[PDB]
Design a protein around this ligand. Structure first.
Ligand code: LMT
Ligand code: HJM
Lengths: 118, 223, 110, 537
């Protein structure tokens, strides 16, 4: 069975940095896009970034380019989202998602448990 | 999980047609090639043909143009192989197999049923032997240049073959750490680290570089 | 960037009545014949479960009550008569690059 | 009557039409099937006996008369004036074929400017489910329903073929190809619109840059590993395969479409100069340079496949069995991004692949436009500039049949019959009418007065005995077996195969229609009405 397992939560100091993990298993992770999304308490969703393990290309929007860096390692079956210059506005839970294949519209199929960055 | 179950044996008069069936399970029927293999009694193994269930296409060795025809029925996950002009030379055991694309290799093997009535490979002597636990080696030579497209099999007495080494240097899933390999171009070597009594079986040296699939002469290690 | 919007912000779906949730956009998302708009499902403390592939095809582990259709700049999440167990906020994604954006979200409950 | 300038421009004009993107498809695709070197030998035999004489007959014919494709037959034999119309109708089908293909290549040239060629990674626009083309350290298997990025790119990013299901259900138009197709007719317009006098300078660059680009591509693949396996796979002869009839028909077929007589384009070119004492020297170089160019053409492809086949851990055989174009647009595209020198050679090949088409597409319209204008001087005298616009717009709607109907379902169906027995039927009757009814002694007379020398008793033996036999052989080869073909696990139904046969059959209905027309309006009795139509001059 497919599953996405993140790391545990972590408290943040103003101006600190965190390192969320997300291990893929049970599918060809090296041929899909690994997503990252915010879930702020009281608002909707806000997309952060995206990466293709195997190539390393990344695409950002929503002003996250000046706050986030994302990498991946095909040999370990993991994708690591790094974040710096955190503040109170970044207080939210972050999810990891597997992008479906493009013939079906890249609907994010399965999800991780989410980790709190506050 | 995957299985390939044939029908039983049968005797047919010389010159008449004979048929064998094979049911598949544990995997999607359309996501692999249904290949067939020939085993003349007391001889090496030889490829028969190939089937594409997605469109009914077939591809087979040039010697089976006026001897056999291939087909399947995907609605029941069943495969058939029709033979014609049967003769005494065709007394052989035929195998039902699974084969994906690019290793042009036989993934798994059925139990095999008895029937009663190009680039080639070569090997060394079929009496190479040594005591149990010693480092063993087998030599296999190619008639033409094949880069790394070679595999190795294990056929115990009364059992079907099985894929052991993959791309001539890596051991397939389900294979102990004892077996290793190496080779490039025309010189291929099959080694055994700490050979055991259970490894006393017949081996084969396959050509994957191009269709038709061709094998070697076959050697056995005893002891 | 493609901006997605939704309305009504909160649907008073009485038990046993039909519900429809729209997803308006600036584009023009129809590319290569595949509708690059999807639907998810959130509950309190639960992951954003998938609902619909390409705004028309049901999802894995998704009940048959949920479906969608449309073309161009306006889709709608047509849903069979709901129960209280379907209390969840539904979000509209767009998977037409460069960027992938989300909608504001509508609260659909009893 | 306007005449052409330097002799060489002529030679560049003809060879640019002689070599095209078709030679990059069929020639390398047919050789190894017929045994590689075992196919090059009959390719050379039939080229000497079958290729050159039908090639120089048409150039030598236009040399003397200078009348085009329609009006010339008023002088040769009046009963065969319908050939020029048959070339025009067939040209309308080939004009569509050719013009849409370059839009698929122009889609690559515009996209190839990006350093990250979207040919190796199924990024966020592909059917990534059946996408895997990174041949890692034995942690992969290739399933039957599996594909590569380049297979998907030519599948659902050029054709958008998933929009449509078959010939019975046709899709819409791609906006990208709609802009690419118009740019192609733009350059085709100005090249002929300015006049045949100016087209000699357009072929000055387009007929020479491919030969440079062949060298630019040849040095790369040759210096990499695996080239020895690629060249060996191609030139290693399979001698016993030569005993089959299919090899001889394919060898005779390749020389015909490689040289391309009977299409009226070669005839129109010789009609613009006397060519005193230099025509036999010009045509003979084209036939050998055309055959050597195709040899070098396929020699580059397999030289690049050899480097892959070393990387791919397999033989070049059983690789991209689908079709000629689908092989080149996909397979050779993969190699460009896999060569370390990418971002440059993606431009070089798909700038010559378009240039080979454009140069050959420029020449195509000149044959038709030369034909009609020679018949209607009230159009040529004042509307010669407007007449070209009527043909280009006419060819635009001809090419539109593919784009706004979903994908390549019209192209491959139109491929097998637009250039089928119709073009061979024309090429046959051009040989029969000029040789048997129109006395070959008179044609041999008309040529030797212009050249200061006669090639008679060698070519003539070939013209009256070898030429009708080995042109009727290609006709008799086609009636035996119906080519039930396929496209991407989709077999074509029966009614469409008959439709393609009907389109190809009706494409040359002009020559029975015209003969039937003249014999009804002609006065006299049954014998007299036939003599008046056959009477030369
Ligand atoms: C082989 O080669 C021949 C000669 O080119 C081609 O096949 C041929 O068959 C049909 C049969 O009517 C002809 O109308 C046509 O001229 C051509 O397509 C194909 O390439 C392949 O079928
Ligand atoms: C020299 C190679 C020849 C082999 C086939 C026939 C011939 C040809 N005839 C035409 C007539 C009209 C036209 O546009 C209006 C295009 C062509 C072409 C296209 C390129 N090829 C294909 C040439």
């Amino acid at each position: 069975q497919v599953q996405l397992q993140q790391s545990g939560p972590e408290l943040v100091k103003l101006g600190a940095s965190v390192r969320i993990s997300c291990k893929a298993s049970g599918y060809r992770f090296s041929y899909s896009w690994m997503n990252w999304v915010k879930q702020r308490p009281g608002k909707g969703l806000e997309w952060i970034g995206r990466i293709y393990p195997g190539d390393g290309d990344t695409k950002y929007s929503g002003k996250f380019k000046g706050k986030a860096t994302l990498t991946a390692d095909k040999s370990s079956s993991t994708v690591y989202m790094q974040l710096s210059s955190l503040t109170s506005e970044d207080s939210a839970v972050y999810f990891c998602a597997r992008s479906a294949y493009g013939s079906e519209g890249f609907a994010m199929d399965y999800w991780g448990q989410g980790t709190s960055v506050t | 999980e995957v299985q390939l179950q044939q029908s039983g044996p049968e005797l047919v008069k010389p010159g008449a047609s004979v048929k064998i069936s094979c049911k598949a399970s544990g995997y999607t029927f359309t996501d692999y090639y249904m290949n067939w293999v020939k085993q003349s009694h007391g001889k090496s193994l030889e490829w028969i043909g190939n089937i594409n269930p997605n469109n009914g296409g077939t591809s087979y060795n040039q010697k089976f143009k006026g001897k056999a025809t291939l087909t399947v029925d995907k609605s029941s996950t069943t495969a058939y192989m029709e033979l014609r002009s049967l003769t005494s030379e065709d007394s052989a055991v035929y195998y039902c197999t699974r084969s994906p694309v690019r290793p042009y290799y036989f993934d798994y093997w059925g139990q095999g049923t008895t029937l009663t009535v190009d680039i080639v490979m070569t090997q060394s002597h079929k009496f190479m032997s040594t005591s149990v636990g010693d480092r063993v080696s087998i030599t296999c030579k190619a008639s033409q240049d094949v880069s790394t497209a070679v595999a190795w099999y294990q056929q115990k007495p009364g059992q079907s073959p099985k894929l052991l080494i993959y791309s001539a240097s890596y051991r397939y899933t389900g294979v102990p750490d004892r077996f290793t390999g190496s080779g490039s171009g025309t010189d291929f070597t099959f080694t055994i680290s700490s050979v055991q009594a259970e490894d006393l079986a017949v081996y084969y040296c396959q050509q994957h570089y191009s269709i038709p699939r061709t094998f070697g002469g076959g050697t056995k290690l005893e002891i | 960037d493609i901006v997605l919007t939704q309305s009504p912000a909160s649907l008073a779906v009485s038990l046993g009545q039909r519900a429809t949730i729209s997803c308006r956009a600036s584009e023009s998302v129809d590319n290569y014949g595949i509708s690059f708009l999807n639907w998810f499902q959130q509950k309190p403390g639960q992951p954003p479960k998938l609902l619909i592939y390409a705004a028309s095809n049901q999802g894995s582990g998704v009940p048959a009550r949920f479906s969608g259709s449309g073309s161009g700049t306006y889709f709608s999440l047509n849903i069979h008569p709901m129960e209280e167990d379907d209390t969840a906020v539904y979000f509209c994604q767009q998977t037409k690059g460069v960027s992938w954006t989300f909608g504001g979200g509508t609260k659909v409950e009893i | 009557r306007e005449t052409w300038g330097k002799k060489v421009d002529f030679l560049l004009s003809v060879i640019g039409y002689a070599v095209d993107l078709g030679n990059v498809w069929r020639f390398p695709y047919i050789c190894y099937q017929n045994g590689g070197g075992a196919f090059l030998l009959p390719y050379t035999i039939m080229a000497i006996f079958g290729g050159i004489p039908l090639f120089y007959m048409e150039l030598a014919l236009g040399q003397y008369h200078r009348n085009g494709c329609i009006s010339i037959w008023r002088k040769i034999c009046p009963i065969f004036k319908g050939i020029g119309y048959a070339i025009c109708i067939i040209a309308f089908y080939i004009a569509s074929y050719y013009n849409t293909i370059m839009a698929w290549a122009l889609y690559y040239l515009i996209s190839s400017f990006t350093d990250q060629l979207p040919w190796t990674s199924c990024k966020n626009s592909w059917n990534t489910g059946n996408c895997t083309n990174y041949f890692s350290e034995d942690n992969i298997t290739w399933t039957l329903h599996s594909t590569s990025p380049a297979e998907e790119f030519y599948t659902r990013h050029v054709l958008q073929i998933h929009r449509s299901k078959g010939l019975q259900d046709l899709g819409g138009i791609s906006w990208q190809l709609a802009l690419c197709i118009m740019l192609i007719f733009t350059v085709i317009y100005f090249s002929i619109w300015k006049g045949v006098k100016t087209s000699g300078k357009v072929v000055w660059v387009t007929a020479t840059f491919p030969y440079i680009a062949l060298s630019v591509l040849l040095v790369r693949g040759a210096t990499l590993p695996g080239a020895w396996r690629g060249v060996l796979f191609y030139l290693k002869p399979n001698w016993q395969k030569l005993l089959e009839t299919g090899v001889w028909i394919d060898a005779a077929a390749q020389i015909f479409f490689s040289l391309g007589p009977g299409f009226g384009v070669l005839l129109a070119f010789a009609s613009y100069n006397k060519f005193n004492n230099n025509c036999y020297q010009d045509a003979l170089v084209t036939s050998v340079v055309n055959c050597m160019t195709s040899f070098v053409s396929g020699f580059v492809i397999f030289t690049v496949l050899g480097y892959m086949a070393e990387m791919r851990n397999e033989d070049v055989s059983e690789v991209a069995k689908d079709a000629g174009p689908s092989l080149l647009f996909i397979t050779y595209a993969e190699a460009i991004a896999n060569m370390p020198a990418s971002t440059f050679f993606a431009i070089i090949f798909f700038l010559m692949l378009i240039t080979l088409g454009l140069d050959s597409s420029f020449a195509g319209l000149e044959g038709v436009i030369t034909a009609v204008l020679d018949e209607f001087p009230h159009v040529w005298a004042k509307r010669r500039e407007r007449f070209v616009l009527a043909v280009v717009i006419t060819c635009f709607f001809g090419s539109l049949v593919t784009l706004t109907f979903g994908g390549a379902y019209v192209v491959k169906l139109l491929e097998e019959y637009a250039t089928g027995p119709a073009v061979l039927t024309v090429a046959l009757i051009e040989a029969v009418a000029v040789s048997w009814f129109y006395g070959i002694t008179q044609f041999c007379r008309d040529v030797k007065e212009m050249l200061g020398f006669s090639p008679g008793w060698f070519w003539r033996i070939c013209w009256v005995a070898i030429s009708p036999l080995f042109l009727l052989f290609i006709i008799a080869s086609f009636l035996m077996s119906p080519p039930q073909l396929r496209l991407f696990q989709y077999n074509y139904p029966y009614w469409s195969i008959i439709l393609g046969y009907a389109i190809g059959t009706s494409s040359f209905i002009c020559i029975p229609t015209y003969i039937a027309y003249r014999l009804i309006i002609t006065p006299g009795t049954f014998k007299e009405r036939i003599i008046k139509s056959i009477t030369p001059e």
